[PDB]
Design a protein around this ligand. Structure first.
Ligand SMILES: NC(=[NH2+])NCCC[C@H](N)C(=O)O
Ligand SMILES: [Mg+2]
Ligand SMILES: [Mg+2]
Ligand SMILES: [Mg+2]
Ligand SMILES: [Mg+2]
Ligand SMILES: [Mg+2]
Ligand SMILES: [Mg+2]
Ligand SMILES: [Mg+2]
Ligand SMILES: [Mg+2]
Ligand SMILES: [Mg+2]
Ligand SMILES: [Mg+2]
Ligand SMILES: [Mg+2]
Ligand SMILES: [Mg+2]
Ligand SMILES: [Mg+2]
Ligand SMILES: [Mg+2]
Ligand SMILES: [Mg+2]
Ligand SMILES: [Mg+2]
Ligand SMILES: [Mg+2]
Ligand SMILES: [Mg+2]
Ligand SMILES: [Mg+2]
Ligand SMILES: [Mg+2]
Ligand SMILES: [Mg+2]
Ligand SMILES: [Mg+2]
Ligand SMILES: [Mg+2]
Ligand SMILES: [Mg+2]
Ligand SMILES: [Mg+2]
Ligand SMILES: [Mg+2]
Ligand SMILES: [Mg+2]
Ligand SMILES: [Mg+2]
Ligand SMILES: [Mg+2]
Ligand SMILES: [Mg+2]
Ligand SMILES: [Mg+2]
Ligand SMILES: [Mg+2]
Ligand SMILES: [Mg+2]
Ligand SMILES: [Mg+2]
Ligand SMILES: [Mg+2]
Ligand SMILES: [Mg+2]
Ligand SMILES: [Mg+2]
Ligand SMILES: [Mg+2]
Ligand SMILES: [Mg+2]
Ligand SMILES: [Mg+2]
Ligand SMILES: [Mg+2]
Ligand SMILES: [Mg+2]
Ligand SMILES: [Mg+2]
Ligand SMILES: [Mg+2]
Ligand SMILES: [Mg+2]
Ligand SMILES: [Mg+2]
Ligand SMILES: [Mg+2]
Ligand SMILES: [Mg+2]
Ligand SMILES: [Mg+2]
Ligand SMILES: [Mg+2]
Ligand SMILES: [Mg+2]
Ligand SMILES: [Mg+2]
Ligand SMILES: [Mg+2]
Ligand SMILES: [Mg+2]
Ligand SMILES: [Mg+2]
Ligand SMILES: [Mg+2]
Ligand SMILES: [Mg+2]
Ligand SMILES: [Mg+2]
Ligand SMILES: [Mg+2]
Ligand SMILES: [Mg+2]
Ligand SMILES: [Mg+2]
Ligand SMILES: [Mg+2]
Ligand SMILES: [Mg+2]
Ligand SMILES: [Mg+2]
Ligand SMILES: [Mg+2]
Ligand SMILES: [Mg+2]
Ligand SMILES: [Mg+2]
Ligand SMILES: [Mg+2]
Ligand SMILES: [Mg+2]
Ligand SMILES: [Mg+2]
Ligand SMILES: [Mg+2]
Ligand SMILES: [Mg+2]
Ligand SMILES: [Mg+2]
Ligand SMILES: [Mg+2]
Ligand SMILES: [Mg+2]
Ligand SMILES: [Mg+2]
Ligand SMILES: [Mg+2]
Ligand SMILES: [Mg+2]
Ligand SMILES: [Mg+2]
Ligand SMILES: [Mg+2]
Ligand SMILES: [Mg+2]
Ligand SMILES: [Mg+2]
Ligand SMILES: [Mg+2]
Ligand SMILES: [Mg+2]
Ligand SMILES: [Mg+2]
Ligand SMILES: [Mg+2]
Ligand SMILES: [Mg+2]
Ligand SMILES: [Mg+2]
Ligand SMILES: [Mg+2]
Ligand SMILES: [Mg+2]
Ligand SMILES: [Mg+2]
Ligand SMILES: [Mg+2]
Ligand SMILES: [Mg+2]
Ligand SMILES: [Mg+2]
Ligand SMILES: [Mg+2]
Ligand SMILES: [Mg+2]
Ligand SMILES: [Mg+2]
Ligand SMILES: [Mg+2]
Ligand SMILES: [Mg+2]
Ligand SMILES: [Mg+2]
Ligand SMILES: [Mg+2]
Ligand SMILES: [Mg+2]
Ligand SMILES: [Mg+2]
Ligand SMILES: [Mg+2]
Ligand SMILES: [Mg+2]
Ligand SMILES: [Mg+2]
Ligand SMILES: [Mg+2]
Ligand SMILES: [Mg+2]
Ligand SMILES: [Mg+2]
Ligand SMILES: [Mg+2]
Ligand SMILES: [Mg+2]
Ligand SMILES: [Mg+2]
Ligand SMILES: [Mg+2]
Ligand SMILES: [Mg+2]
Ligand SMILES: [Mg+2]
Ligand SMILES: [Mg+2]
Ligand SMILES: [Mg+2]
Ligand SMILES: [Mg+2]
Ligand SMILES: [Mg+2]
Ligand SMILES: [Mg+2]
Ligand SMILES: [Mg+2]
Ligand SMILES: [Mg+2]
Ligand SMILES: [Mg+2]
Ligand SMILES: [Mg+2]
Ligand SMILES: [Mg+2]
Ligand SMILES: [Mg+2]
Ligand SMILES: [Mg+2]
Ligand SMILES: [Mg+2]
Ligand SMILES: [Mg+2]
Ligand SMILES: [Mg+2]
Ligand SMILES: [Mg+2]
Ligand SMILES: [Mg+2]
Ligand SMILES: [Mg+2]
Ligand SMILES: [Mg+2]
Ligand SMILES: [Mg+2]
Ligand SMILES: [Mg+2]
Ligand SMILES: [Mg+2]
Ligand SMILES: [Mg+2]
Ligand SMILES: [Mg+2]
Ligand SMILES: [Mg+2]
Ligand SMILES: [Mg+2]
Ligand SMILES: [Mg+2]
Ligand SMILES: [Mg+2]
Ligand SMILES: [Mg+2]
Ligand SMILES: [Mg+2]
Ligand SMILES: [Mg+2]
Ligand SMILES: [Mg+2]
Ligand SMILES: [Mg+2]
Ligand SMILES: [Mg+2]
Ligand SMILES: [Mg+2]
Ligand SMILES: [Mg+2]
Ligand SMILES: [Mg+2]
Ligand SMILES: [Mg+2]
Ligand SMILES: [Mg+2]
Ligand SMILES: [Mg+2]
Ligand SMILES: [Mg+2]
Ligand SMILES: [Mg+2]
Ligand SMILES: [Mg+2]
Ligand SMILES: [Mg+2]
Ligand SMILES: [Mg+2]
Ligand SMILES: [Mg+2]
Ligand SMILES: [Mg+2]
Ligand SMILES: [Mg+2]
Ligand SMILES: [Mg+2]
Ligand SMILES: [Mg+2]
Ligand SMILES: [Mg+2]
Ligand SMILES: [Mg+2]
Ligand SMILES: [Mg+2]
Ligand SMILES: [Mg+2]
Ligand SMILES: [Mg+2]
Ligand SMILES: [Mg+2]
Ligand SMILES: [Mg+2]
Ligand SMILES: [Zn+2]
Lengths: 140, 59, 112, 101, 154, 116
RNA sequence: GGCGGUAGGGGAGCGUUCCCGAUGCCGAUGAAGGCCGACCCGCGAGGGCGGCUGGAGGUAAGGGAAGUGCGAAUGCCGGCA
RNA sequence: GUGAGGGCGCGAGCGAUAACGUCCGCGUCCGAGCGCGGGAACAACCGAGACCGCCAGCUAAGGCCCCCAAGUCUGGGCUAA
RNA sequence: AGUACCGUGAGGGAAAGGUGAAAAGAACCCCGGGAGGGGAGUGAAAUAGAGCCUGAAACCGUGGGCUUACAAGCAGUCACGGCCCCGAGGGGUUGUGGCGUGCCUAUUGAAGCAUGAGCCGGCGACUCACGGUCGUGGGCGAGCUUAAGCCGUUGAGGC
């Protein structure tokens, strides 16, 4: 007998409120949901995770003095092209990218990890446009 | 100059990918409005000697 | 029915004549005729001779209509090489390979 | 109605009328053997602790065979040690006759 | 490499050539050069102990006797150098040709008559050997040949 | 007598080149590159048919864990409950029950909870 | 009960050329060699078998004898990149 | 066959209570285990001596929030860097 | 063939065999300047057509199947899936996931930015004599054995 490999099923849409939650502790759960590791038919070679919509990402919280101390970095390939941006400037300029980076750093590397990251939709503020998909509110 | 030299024999894949732009394009021909023979545009028809609707050259 | 023609030991480089052969494969006989006629290459002459010999084979030997002929197959093979000595500087002797081609053209009838 | 049987050190889920290669068994072909049961499922659910007492699966041995040869080869670099072994795992073919609760 | 018919000149300098170092073209590493440890004329003969040869002769005749394929004759009726006469004599003696026979006698005429048969090996008695005995399926001998065989194995 | 190479070396090279079917470029066309690639492949095959058992077991564990967390407890709690209960149904069939017959797996979860 | 293994010691086999076996046996109803096979035997080196090519040679059991097994020597010769 | 050893631990000498330093002693491991698990990766640190197979089970070091198999496990205290 | 070729010279010193049983070696026609080819024709066979038995490999090409333009690689392997083929099985292909530091040589230690190798095919290295020393299969045994030679054989042994 071989192990059951599922047929390509319909993925479910899920909505999460980020407000007041801890950045990393919510990020790990978002990533697990993207993996499909909450489903008993999970398989590592296919994309079968949920579609995770997130609102109020601009109101994420974080412990300690990480407002002025966490430093995201970008090396543009040129000499001296090392950008250092703090968490405060990030929250005030591209706030959803905070959650985006925190999740992207927790998904596997390779192609499948990239499309899994494409299955996540982060939105600053309380409003999202995926009303057509009718997401399921989750209390994570 | 210290005589640069190929480091490794090029794989058939790589040489043919380099040659991927070597395909000839076929000529550009139109019918001559007298003998209906295929000829390059803006040239005098080499099959009837006509251009712009008159004889110019003995064919 | 098919009708083939081969020009063996054509003194020219295969990689050079294949460039012109690739221009007429799958084309109708008249299309290939004009195409070879106004192709600015050396191998155009030889591909033209082989195509005409094939069409003559078709008509005069295999009961095929001239107005139904097209280039069903067309491939160049490489033949023996004429290795020549080329004197270089400082007394070194190179070997130039003067290559040769086997042109093959196969025609058929385009019914309809 | 299905039964989780344990043979050859491994457990398979069987149903009536199922062909199954298991490890080799000391049994003449065409004869019949009873396989222990660890769990019965389907219309009713009884869980073995570890086996279930009066339950057995009747299966008919269809014959014995050798599997597809595996080339197990070992290579140790810079030491001139190379080994080539062919291995064909002996198996027995069984057909599950009935589930005896 | 010393017997090959080339000279011993160094083909090109030792160093700074770009090629591999070499001596002459008679080196066995070259095509057409000498051959390493090639066979030379040899003598595969050795002196086998005499008693071993004599005991082997005895043992071969003893094997053919214990099998029942041994037969002694006094003379050869009327064979006088013709194969047909020997064919008649052998047909009467019980030799149909389905078993290879080792005829051994001192009469040259019989050996001449019999030597062309594809199933007969002829031998003079002084030339009895264990190979030809084991070679053939039956063994036939003169009484003279038998006596000189008893005198050789004695 | 002189025993030249003759016929053997070609046959051995063809045997090694047949095993090389499908390899990229000269790895299927050159006998030597083929032989090297085949050394690598054979060692890979041995080690990977070793590691496949761990691979599948880890997948089974992930699936059993998802099914168990659907019923309150986690994997470790569940396997402890099974150990104490006396249930010796391995993880392959355990995942097969978790997906194919969820009622039997829920009963197993019940016995595991109660067995502590 | 033992069985990772370099230098190295010992053991057992496979295959190539030649001789005895052989005035025999296989062979135009196809020899040797070549191209395939997901088929069979062998742990393996290998041996079978089947199809295609090939067009005249091949050679058993059991023994014997060696110019007896290549991937490298900036190897040697040739062919083509 | 070897008579080029090397890392680590302990005991010393040489050195500067320097060196992936050097020279001995006891031991170990690599060498030959650049096979396997851990240590991000890594001959010699930790676990452990690989006959072959299995989509079975138990452990070692090490681990159980995500990448990444298993606790966002239980009880007490400290730390704000 | 001591040729061609190299050298002032002494001297060095190659490559290169095969149609078929029989030339029956392809009249004649067709495209072409020719070469070459296509029919006819010969033959048991013409991918035996003279660049000729068998025709391997590298290497160049035509066609068909699977696959490939967001992807990080000693090029494989394990698992699953899709497509194609031959008829609870098997073959071909590779999308995704896991794992993974070419071979040889030399070294304390190499994937190593240490050595060697463009690739294929063929050639290429532990032998022989005599003596010695162990072990082993036999023969004889206080004995064992002959060398050169002589006779016989013409692959016969004996003295
Ligand atoms: N009488 C004899 N010893 N003959 C010995 C063999 C003679 C000859 N060579 C043959 O076989 O015909
Ligand atoms: Mg969750
Ligand atoms: Mg934080
Ligand atoms: Mg923005
Ligand atoms: Mg990973
Ligand atoms: Mg310069
Ligand atoms: Mg320059
Ligand atoms: Mg200059
Ligand atoms: Mg420049
Ligand atoms: Mg230059
Ligand atoms: Mg190339
Ligand atoms: Mg390629
Ligand atoms: Mg390129
Ligand atoms: Mg190509
Ligand atoms: Mg005119
Ligand atoms: Mg043009
Ligand atoms: Mg015409
Ligand atoms: Mg010049
Ligand atoms: Mg010069
Ligand atoms: Mg000059
Ligand atoms: Mg060149
Ligand atoms: Mg050249
Ligand atoms: Mg059992
Ligand atoms: Mg069934
Ligand atoms: Mg099995
Ligand atoms: Mg078995
Ligand atoms: Mg290696
Ligand atoms: Mg090695
Ligand atoms: Mg090796
Ligand atoms: Mg010499
Ligand atoms: Mg000399
Ligand atoms: Mg000489
Ligand atoms: Mg000389
Ligand atoms: Mg000379
Ligand atoms: Mg000299
Ligand atoms: Mg010399
Ligand atoms: Mg000299
Ligand atoms: Mg060289
Ligand atoms: Mg030399
Ligand atoms: Mg010489
Ligand atoms: Mg010679
Ligand atoms: Mg010679
Ligand atoms: Mg030699
Ligand atoms: Mg020598
Ligand atoms: Mg002599
Ligand atoms: Mg002698
Ligand atoms: Mg005779
Ligand atoms: Mg005879
Ligand atoms: Mg005779
Ligand atoms: Mg004779
Ligand atoms: Mg050889
Ligand atoms: Mg060969
Ligand atoms: Mg072979
Ligand atoms: Mg072959
Ligand atoms: Mg492939
Ligand atoms: Mg290829
Ligand atoms: Mg192998
Ligand atoms: Mg492993
Ligand atoms: Mg294994
Ligand atoms: Mg295990
Ligand atoms: Mg829980
Ligand atoms: Mg437990
Ligand atoms: Mg258990
Ligand atoms: Mg062991
Ligand atoms: Mg061993
Ligand atoms: Mg050992
Ligand atoms: Mg042998
Ligand atoms: Mg010979
Ligand atoms: Mg001979
Ligand atoms: Mg004979
Ligand atoms: Mg014969
Ligand atoms: Mg016959
Ligand atoms: Mg015939
Ligand atoms: Mg032969
Ligand atoms: Mg075979
Ligand atoms: Mg044999
Ligand atoms: Mg034939
Ligand atoms: Mg054959
Ligand atoms: Mg003959
Ligand atoms: Mg043979
Ligand atoms: Mg023989
Ligand atoms: Mg034999
Ligand atoms: Mg013999
Ligand atoms: Mg040799
Ligand atoms: Mg080697
Ligand atoms: Mg090798
Ligand atoms: Mg070189
Ligand atoms: Mg060089
Ligand atoms: Mg070179
Ligand atoms: Mg180099
Ligand atoms: Mg070479
Ligand atoms: Mg070589
Ligand atoms: Mg060379
Ligand atoms: Mg060369
Ligand atoms: Mg070139
Ligand atoms: Mg030494
Ligand atoms: Mg010394
Ligand atoms: Mg040293
Ligand atoms: Mg020393
Ligand atoms: Mg020391
Ligand atoms: Mg040191
Ligand atoms: Mg030490
Ligand atoms: Mg300590
Ligand atoms: Mg110390
Ligand atoms: Mg200090
Ligand atoms: Mg120190
Ligand atoms: Mg110190
Ligand atoms: Mg030192
Ligand atoms: Mg020292
Ligand atoms: Mg080593
Ligand atoms: Mg060493
Ligand atoms: Mg050790
Ligand atoms: Mg390695
Ligand atoms: Mg390494
Ligand atoms: Mg390790
Ligand atoms: Mg590690
Ligand atoms: Mg790790
Ligand atoms: Mg290690
Ligand atoms: Mg456990
Ligand atoms: Mg522990
Ligand atoms: Mg960790
Ligand atoms: Mg802990
Ligand atoms: Mg990550
Ligand atoms: Mg997890
Ligand atoms: Mg806690
Ligand atoms: Mg500070
Ligand atoms: Mg001079
Ligand atoms: Mg001259
Ligand atoms: Mg000279
Ligand atoms: Mg020469
Ligand atoms: Mg002939
Ligand atoms: Mg002839
Ligand atoms: Mg004509
Ligand atoms: Mg003409
Ligand atoms: Mg004309
Ligand atoms: Mg002509
Ligand atoms: Mg023509
Ligand atoms: Mg013709
Ligand atoms: Mg005819
Ligand atoms: Mg016939
Ligand atoms: Mg043929
Ligand atoms: Mg032929
Ligand atoms: Mg040729
Ligand atoms: Mg030929
Ligand atoms: Mg012949
Ligand atoms: Mg040819
Ligand atoms: Mg070929
Ligand atoms: Mg293609
Ligand atoms: Mg794409
Ligand atoms: Mg991207
Ligand atoms: Mg990476
Ligand atoms: Mg890699
Ligand atoms: Mg398939
Ligand atoms: Mg996995
Ligand atoms: Mg992969
Ligand atoms: Mg690598
Ligand atoms: Mg060295
Ligand atoms: Mg060194
Ligand atoms: Mg060193
Ligand atoms: Mg290297
Ligand atoms: Mg490199
Ligand atoms: Mg060196
Ligand atoms: Mg080397
Ligand atoms: Mg070179
Ligand atoms: Mg190549
Ligand atoms: Mg070779
Ligand atoms: Mg020796
Ligand atoms: Mg010798
Ligand atoms: Mg000797
Ligand atoms: Mg000795
Ligand atoms: Mg004696
Ligand atoms: Mg005795
Ligand atoms: Mg004596
Ligand atoms: Zn005109």
């Amino acid at each position: 007998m071989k192990t059951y490999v599922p047929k390509q099923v319909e993925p479910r849409w899920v909505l999460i409120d980020a407000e007041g939650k801890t950045l990393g502790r919510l990020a790990t759960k978002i990533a697990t949901l993207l993996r499909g590791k909450h489903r008993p038919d999970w398989t590592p070679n296919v994309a079968m995770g949920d579609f995770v919509v997130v609102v109020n990402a601009d109101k994420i919280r974080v412990t300690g003095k990480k407002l002025e101390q966490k430093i995201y970095t970008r090396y543009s390939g040129y000499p001296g092209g090392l950008k250092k941006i703090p968490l405060e400037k990030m929250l005030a300029t591209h706030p959803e990218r905070v959650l985006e980076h925190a999740v992207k750093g927790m998904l596997p590397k390779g192609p499948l990890g990239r499309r899994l990251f494409k299955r996540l939709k982060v939105y600053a503020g309380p409003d999202h446009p995926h009303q057509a998909q009718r997401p399921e509110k989750l209390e994570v | 100059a210290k005589h640069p030299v190929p480091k490794k024999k090029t794989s058939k894949a790589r040489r043919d990918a380099r040659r991927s732009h070597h395909a000839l394009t076929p000529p550009i021909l139109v019918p001559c409005p007298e003998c209906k023979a295929m000829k390059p545009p803006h040239t005098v028809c080499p099959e009837c000697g006509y251009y712009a609707g008159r004889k110019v050259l003995e064919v | 029915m098919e009708a083939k023609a081969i020009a063996r030991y054509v003194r020219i480089s295969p990689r050079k004549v294949r460039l012109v052969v690739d221009l007429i494969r799958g084309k109708s006989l008249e299309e290939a005729r004009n195409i070879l006629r106004y192709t600015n290459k050396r191998g155009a002459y030889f591909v033209a001779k082989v195509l005409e010999s094939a069409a003559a084979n078709a008509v005069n030997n295999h009961d095929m209509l001239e107005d139904r002929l097209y280039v069903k197959a067309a491939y160049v093979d490489e033949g023996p090489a004429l290795k020549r000595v080329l004197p270089r500087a400082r007394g070194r002797a190179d070997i130039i390979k003067k290559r040769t081609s086997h042109i093959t053209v196969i025609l058929g009838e385009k019914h309809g | 109605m299905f039964a989780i049987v344990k043979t050859g050190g491994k457990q398979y889920r069987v149903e009536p009328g199922l062909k199954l290669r298991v490890e080799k068994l000391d049994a003449e072909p065409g004869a019949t053997v009873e396989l222990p049961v660890l769990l019965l499922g389907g219309e009713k659910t009884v869980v073995g602790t570890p086996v279930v007492e009066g339950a057995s699966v009747v299966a008919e041995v269809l014959g014995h065979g050798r599997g597809k040869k595996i080339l197990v080869s070992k290579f140790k670099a810079k030491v001139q040690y190379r080994r080539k072994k062919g291995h064909r795992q002996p198996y027995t073919e069984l057909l599950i006759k009935e589930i005896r609760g | 490499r010393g017997e090959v018919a080339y000279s011993g000149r160094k083909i090109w300098p030792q160093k700074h050539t770009g090629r591999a170092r070499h001596g002459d073209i008679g080196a066995p590493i070259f095509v057409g050069g000498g051959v390493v440890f090639g066979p030379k004329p040899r003598d595969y003969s050795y002196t086998l102990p005499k008693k071993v040869r004599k005991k082997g002769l005895a043992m071969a005749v003893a094997d053919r006797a214990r099998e029942g394929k041994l037969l002694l004759v006094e003379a050869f009726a009327g064979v006088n150098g013709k194969t047909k006469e020997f064919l008649a004599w052998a047909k009467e003696a019980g030799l149909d040709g389905s078993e290879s026979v080792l005829l051994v006698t001192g009469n040259e005429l019989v050996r001449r008559a019999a030597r062309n048969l594809p199933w007969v090996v002829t031998l003079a008695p002084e030339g009895l050997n264990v190979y030809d005995i084991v070679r053939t399926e039956r063994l036939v001998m003169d009484l003279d040949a038998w006596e000189v065989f008893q005198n050789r194995i004695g | 007598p002189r025993a030249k190479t003759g016929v053997v070396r070609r046959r051995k090279h063809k045997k090694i080149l047949k095993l090389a079917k499908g390899y990229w470029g000269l790895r299927s066309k050159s006998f030597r590159k083929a032989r090297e690639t085949l050394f690598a492949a054979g060692n890979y095959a041995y080690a990977h048919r070793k590691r496949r058992k761990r691979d599948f077991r880890r997948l089974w564990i992930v699936r059993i864990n998802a099914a168990c967390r659907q019923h309150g407890l986690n994997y470790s709690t569940f396997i402890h409950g099974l150990k104490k209960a006396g249930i010796e149904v391995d993880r392959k069939n355990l995942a097969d029950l978790a997906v194919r017959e969820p009622q039997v797996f829920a009963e197993l979860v019940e016995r595991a909870k109660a067995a502590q």
